[PDB]
Design a protein around this ligand. Structure first.
Ligand SMILES: Bc1ccc([C@H](O)CCc2ccc(O)c(C(=O)O)c2)cc1
Length: 539
């Protein structure tokens, strides 16, 4: 009974041959030749850019980079916040086979270093506002030869724009419509180097195959959205941290108009939803809970709105139903995905929504639950660790096969670290830190309630509450604590403090264990074991 191992259906679109760059180029060239087809729309400055514009300039950046000298043994960095120019160097680079590491616009200067030491990039594309931060970081990274400014047409601080850079390297008679992109092995050639849990962000290497699969999902009437003319999307989610990246690529495959918003604003948001006739909106999790509090939605004509998507962020069932009610939608489309799996591999399918589920397994994939101790795969309705195997899994963490391994067993399964179960109808469900309850006496306090108290203390930098299992009491509630840098404290001084703000059953009878860091779990969510694990010895 390899039969409690859950399997994604058949694709509507078969996987297509070619690299990620070869199929983007082929799709975009189709839409380039229809004048007026809009690719991106900047909701802030109201400017539109057509596929003809988008195709042509991307191609030129590909042949201008090829000439400069970049082959698949080089990487570039794109450092900018969501913009009309963002996917120009990305598209151009994939056409070449150069690996793209999107960097985080307002990563502070330290996290800009950690990202770029892993990605070791020859050329860096950057927005005017990102420039000095990358200048500073270039004087600490010798590999960064060239800096190109994305949001200019002229040069800017003597530095060169994509536009003058391209005319500085394209050969005399270059022809955007005779360009052909490189063929290369899509399994070994890295398309994207993404970022990320505990410690410092790693570099998740993802080869062209994962985007090629993604391109099969995006069109899927069940797991993506149907190629209808005049489809538009309002995307707020960042063009890096996952979601934003691979929906937009799939959206360019489909010919959709991607309406981007880089700064969030309620009225701007809702009006763009209305005016652009948006079919589906993309949101980050805490923009869902915001929209649960919105009372203006009713004043806008969202007659056209079909879907609101949360991506690979699993949603509180209460927040999801709230958002969907304020917009008069049957449901939210939530899914579960890891950066280490490119896109989501659990997605709620069209129509088949089921209250509280993230969804079912995407085509090309297998997902299963495994018992946390024996490792044996479990059956229907049992909670275990969620494990997934399929083409979109990360190739590895750059410069870190010690982490790549033991995250992926060499039967090709990624072990999520997150806990789940599935239905007799094959829906999956994710279990969160946030409603695992600590039974002392026999009534239970949420660990988030006790964490909120602990984080309130000026000398407690981070906390993590879990239930110390003791034989007499049932569960004594305990915490792992991280002290602020200057400060010093004592276990009892900490529980004295809690036991002054909680009922008396909610008191921190389990004690505190001082840790350098509270264990997170891949999607950043607090890991309920390890914490429980950590306290069990210290007692
Ligand atoms: B960390 C992370 C990793 C991956 C992702 C996925 O790319 C989301 C994919 C998705 C979800 C819902 C949709 O409706 C659509 C779509 O519009 O096709 C697409 C999100 C976060």
């Amino acid at each position: 009974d390899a039969k409690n191992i859950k399997k994604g259906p058949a694709p509507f679109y078969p996987l297509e041959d070619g690299t990620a760059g070869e199929q983007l180029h082929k799709a975009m060239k189709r839409y380039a030749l229809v004048p007026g087809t809009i690719a991106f729309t900047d909701a802030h400055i109201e400017v539109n850019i057509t596929y003809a514009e988008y195709f042509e300039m991307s191609v030129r950046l590909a042949e201008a980079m090829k000439r400069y000298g970049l082959n698949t043994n080089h990487r570039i960095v794109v450092c900018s916040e969501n913009s009309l120019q963002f996917f120009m160097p990305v598209l151009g680079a994939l056409f070449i086979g150069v690996a793209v590491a999107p960097a985080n616009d307002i990563y502070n200067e330290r996290e800009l270093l950690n990202s770029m030491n892993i990605s070791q990039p020859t050329v860096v594309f950057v927005s005017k506002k990102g420039l000095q931060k990358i200048l500073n970081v270039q004087k600490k990274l010798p590999i960064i030869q060239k800096i190109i400014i994305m949001d200019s047409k002229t040069d800017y601080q003597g530095f060169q724009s994509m536009y003058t850079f391209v005319t500085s390297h394209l050969p005399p008679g270059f022809n955007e419509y005779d360009f052909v992109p490189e063929s290369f092995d899509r399994d070994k050639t890295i398309a994207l180097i993404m970022n990320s849990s505990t410690g410092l962000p790693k570099g998740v290497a993802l080869p062209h195959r994962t985007a090629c699969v993604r391109f099969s999902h995006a069109r899927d009437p069940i797991f993506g959205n149907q190629i209808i003319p005049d489809t538009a999307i309002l995307s707020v989610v960042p063009f890096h941290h996952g979601f934003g990246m691979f929906t937009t690529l799939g959206y360019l495959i489909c010919g959709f108009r991607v309406v981007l918003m880089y700064r969030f604003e309620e009225e701007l948001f809702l009006r763009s939803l209305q005016d652009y006739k948006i079919q589906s909106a993309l949101l980050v999790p805490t923009l869902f809970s915001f929209f649960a509090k919105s009372t203006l939605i009713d004043k806008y004509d969202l007659s056209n709105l079909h879907e609101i998507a949360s991506g690979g962020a699993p949603l509180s069932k209460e927040v999801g139903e709230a958002v969907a009610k304020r917009f008069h939608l049957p449901g939210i489309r939530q899914g579960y995905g890891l950066t280490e799996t490119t896109s989501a591999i659990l997605i709620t399918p069209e129509g088949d929504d089921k209250p509280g589920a993230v969804g079912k397994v995407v085509p090309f994939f297998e997902a299963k639950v495994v018992d946390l101790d024996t490792g044996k795969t479990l059956g229907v309705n049992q909670r275990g660790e969620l494990c997934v195997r399929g083409p979109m899994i990360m190739s590895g963490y750059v410069n870190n096969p010690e982490a790549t391994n033991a995250l992926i067993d060499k039967d090709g399964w990624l072990h999520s670290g997150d806990i789940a179960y599935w239905d007799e109808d094959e829906h999956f469900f994710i279990v969160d830190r946030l409603k695992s309850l600590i039974k002392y006496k026999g009534y239970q306090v949420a660990p988030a309630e006790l964490e909120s108290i602990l984080l309130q203390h000026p000398n407690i930098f981070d906390a993590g509450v879990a239930g110390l299992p003791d034989d007499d009491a049932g569960e004594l509630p305990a915490a792992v604590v991280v002290l602020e840098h200057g400060k010093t404290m004592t276990e009892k001084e900490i529980v004295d403090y809690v036991a002054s703000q909680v009922t008396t059953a909610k008191k921190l009878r389990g004690g505190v264990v001082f840790v350098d860091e509270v264990p997170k779990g891949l999607t950043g969510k607090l890991d309920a074991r390890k914490i429980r694990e950590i306290l069990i010895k210290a007692k």
